Structure 1
Amino acid sequence: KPTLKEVVIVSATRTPIGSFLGSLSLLPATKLGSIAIQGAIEKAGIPKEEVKEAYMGNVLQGGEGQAPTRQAVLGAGLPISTPCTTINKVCASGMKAIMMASQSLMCGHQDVMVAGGMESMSNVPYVMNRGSTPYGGVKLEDLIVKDGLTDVYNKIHMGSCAENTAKKLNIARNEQDAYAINSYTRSKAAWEAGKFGNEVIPVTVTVKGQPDVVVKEDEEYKRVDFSKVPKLKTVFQKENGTVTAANASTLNDGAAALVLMTADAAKRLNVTPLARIVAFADAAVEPIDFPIAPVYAASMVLKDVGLKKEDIAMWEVNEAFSLVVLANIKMLEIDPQKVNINGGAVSLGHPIGMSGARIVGHLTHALKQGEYGLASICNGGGGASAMLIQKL
């Protein structure tokens, strides 16, 4: 069995998450990426020159220009000698980036890296095929819908795949609506309690001839009306539906970044690590059955390390849909009071390439010394990633 370098997280920072066409919509994903990368190096207390390589998750790259990760990195003022790779595992991209960076560090191939995710759904373009215009016209397709939200094999929206799981596991509209209100409640309380003080950095939006706007908290959690929640119409299934706009995640803009290093490099640089990356895994199922893939990924991680579900102090199961979280709670049989305790994607929003990084960053700050955190995240195609960390 290989003898590997130990991998630690020294910082984890993110921009606030902006609403679709909302507060951060004038900023390209690469600029949000630059902001999170700069913030994370500042918080790590290290020279920018120490960062050897960068990986960033980013699902909808069309129209962002050549090499998005290179743009974010050079935009953050890191050396032109820094190699860059952009990662796409759909909704899992931000986590898979951290995983792959960890593997490089484990091998001794680099001693310090930046890893995370970025997405500007506000700036995702429409496409027109190459070739000749057909008589009678054409619809130009929305890349959010075509590349981001539509299952290739079933030719249906992610939300309609979720209805499939709602059926099999008997997870009703009222249960999903209750989970959703719970998420919005938890997000608000966390923000009010100042729980994001270290994690989130403000972004100043500048427009020539107009006043500056400082965006210092997540935009999405205030965009709800609890009285309307149970009256909303089910968009992805008109007949016997359970998923709505309120209980599903939303379209958003944001970036997150982590400074990762070997335990050795943390010592050399006289920095105090926050958590240790212990294990991680990918699992896959039938594409339509993506909501349950995180069950299997999580069990793999637990089994690999020889821990039991009860050993986990804090769970982050990405809230792609309220259904997804409930499906995981049911199948794993874990205590819901330990799941997504400070809100999640249903109320905070889902910039798809960054969510995987955000949830790992959140565990890092929220866990108490010695406690174990497990983050898992489903993705388009029938996949999931999961990661176990231990607070230091």
Structure 2
Amino acid sequence: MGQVLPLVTRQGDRIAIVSGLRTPFARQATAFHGIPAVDLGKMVVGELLARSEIPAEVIEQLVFGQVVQMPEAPNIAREIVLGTGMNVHTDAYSVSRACATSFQAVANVAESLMAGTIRAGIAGGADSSSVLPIGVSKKLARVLVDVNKARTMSQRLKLFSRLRLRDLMPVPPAVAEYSTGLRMGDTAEQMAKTYGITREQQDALAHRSHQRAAQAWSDGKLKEEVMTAFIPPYKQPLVEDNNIRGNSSLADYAKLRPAFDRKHGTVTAANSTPLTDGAAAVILMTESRAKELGLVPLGYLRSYAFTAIDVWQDMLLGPAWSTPLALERAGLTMSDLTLIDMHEAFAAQTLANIQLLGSERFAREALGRAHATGEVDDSKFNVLGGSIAYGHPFAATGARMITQTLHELRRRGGGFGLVTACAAGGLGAAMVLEAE
């Protein structure tokens, strides 16, 4: 039968998205250098409150997750409200789910206003690659444990005996799966060898997204939700995304050596999201209170979907898995979609997912559904470019797609938005938006 999840409250009011704003992004070692991710938290929300003029006391919950966590701030959510002007009595917290924490926030917060304990929420996050809280070798940390617990002064020197010249070398950061050791590009790479992804089509997508995203910046459509960031030295503000290379050619892409597998890989820096920094803040709250305080929501909410799959082989197939289930819960179809989006983490896994969304045999045994998802039309797919352009600021990637589509489906007829996104740990995120 119909396995549909109505996203309407106890009183029947549907879950509504009223607005949001995006911090512009810059590469690592750029204007966004050495800035704590917590500081981006205050800045993105503080101006958003003022621009919105929504009261800071009416809000009753908010959760920003973040990749590249820092231990100096265990509960970043408390710090922002203690840093920003919102009421100290808000009962906020933080969560973490890979590169789709924005969507992770979307899930657990939309249900928060489903409970009736609250009425409004705030969505967003901040991750920056220019800042890393790196520590020393693990045993060196273990060594320091005993010395604090040591009681005899002469015992310490005996404890200092175990050392080496390479010990003072700190541990460099890592991105490959801890229990797997496969970097995310590697899993995208093996798919290119598994299913067949030429570099020319992967590089063409890098060109198309660059041409599309730069055109959106050239069209200036992403202006009313993109912040004009100021850097505390206050030298000059940032207005446009410098990551996008809108003046580029496919030939320039093809001269890049493959980064991970330098033997026969079909992915390079050209067709891979670079390390970008930024923040985001988006407002979610039920439609009834929006009319109660007299505000029109920037669209609405229809459904949500998330899947856990294998990491050993083909880990970025979450969107391939999650696509039919979301339309099942929405009672809709890929055809019944004005626009479609997916997080262009890699051009290889991009072509892989849409091909698998169109692979009927994929849904026959892996999913067992009645029919495969459908055909993803490239025209509506990532109209404003994709992640191969703006970049991958990790956490905010989910919300940034939320921003463009709701405006874009505002730029068009109401339609029904849809975004899909892969995540670490065999995780995929998918959902159908309304946008009226």
Q: TM-score, normalised by structure 2?
A: 0.84
SS where residue 124 of structure 1 aligns? coil
In structure 1, the residue matched to 2:142 is 131
Q: Does the 8 Å CA contact 1:329/1:335 hold for their aligned counterparts?
A: no
Task: Specify which of 276, 289, 300 is matched with residue 252 of structure 1.
Answer: 276
Q: Does the 8 Å CA contact 2:211/2:246 hold for their aligned counterparts?
A: no
Asked whether 1:112 is paired with 2:104, we answer no
Q: Does the 8 Å CA contact 2:384/2:404 hold for their aligned counterparts?
A: no
- Structure 1 counterpart of 2:323, one-letter code: A
Q: Distance in 2 between matches of 1:3 and 1:18?
A: 36
Q: CA deviation at 1:307?
A: 0.8
The correspondence of residues 1-392 of structure 1 with structure 2, limited to 5 A, is 4-5=8-9, 6-128=14-136, 129=138, 130-132=141-143, 134-138=163-167, 139-143=169-173, 145=174, 149-207=175-233, 212-222=235-245, 225-226=248-249, 227-288=251-312, 289-332=314-357, 333-367=375-409, 368-392=412-436
Q: Which has the larger radius of gyration?
A: 2
Q: CA deviation at 1:114?
A: 0.5
- Structure 1 consecutive aligned stretches of length 4 or more whose deviation exceeds 4 Å: none
For residues 157 and 224 of structure 1, do their structure 2 counterparts lie closer, same or farther at Cα, with a shift above 3 Å needed? Answer: farther
SS where residue 85 of structure 2 aligns? coil
Q: CA deviation at 1:153?
A: 2.9
Question: Residue by residue, what CA displacement relative to the aligned partner does 1:84-110 show, whole Å, maximum 9, x if unpaired?
Answer: 222211111111111211111122231
* Structure 2 segments unaligned to the other structure (5+ residues): 144-161, 358-374
Q: CA deviation at 1:321?
A: 1.0
Give the number of aligned pairs: 385
Q: Does the 8 Å CA contact 1:298/1:374 hold for their aligned counterparts?
A: no
Q: Distance in 1 between matches of 2:343 and 2:51?
A: 25
State the percentage of identical aligned residues: 31
Question: Residue by residue, what CA displacement relative to the aligned partner does 1:239-275 show, whole Å, maximum 9, x if unpaired?
Answer: 2101111101111111111111111110111111111
Question: Residue by residue, what CA displacement relative to the aligned partner does 1:338-385 show, whole Å, maximum 9, x if unpaired?
Answer: 111111221111111111111112211111342111111111111011
* Structure 1 segments unaligned to the other structure (5+ residues): none
Q: CA deviation at 1:223?
A: 8.5
SS where residue 90 of structure 2 aligns? coil
Q: Does the 8 Å CA contact 2:95/2:101 hold for their aligned counterparts?
A: yes
Q: Does the 8 Å CA contact 1:117/1:255 hold for their aligned counterparts?
A: yes
Q: TM-score, normalised by structure 1?
A: 0.93
Question: Residue by residue, what CA displacement relative to the aligned partner does 1:11-56 show, whole Å, maximum 9, x if unpaired?
Answer: 1101101110111224211121222222433444411211111111
For residues 10 and 89 of structure 1, do their structure 2 counterparts lie closer, same or farther at Cα, with a shift above 3 Å needed? Answer: same
- Structure 2 counterpart of 1:371, one-letter code: G
Q: CA deviation at 1:172?
A: 1.3
Q: CA deviation at 1:134?
A: 4.8
In structure 1, the residue matched to 2:155 is none
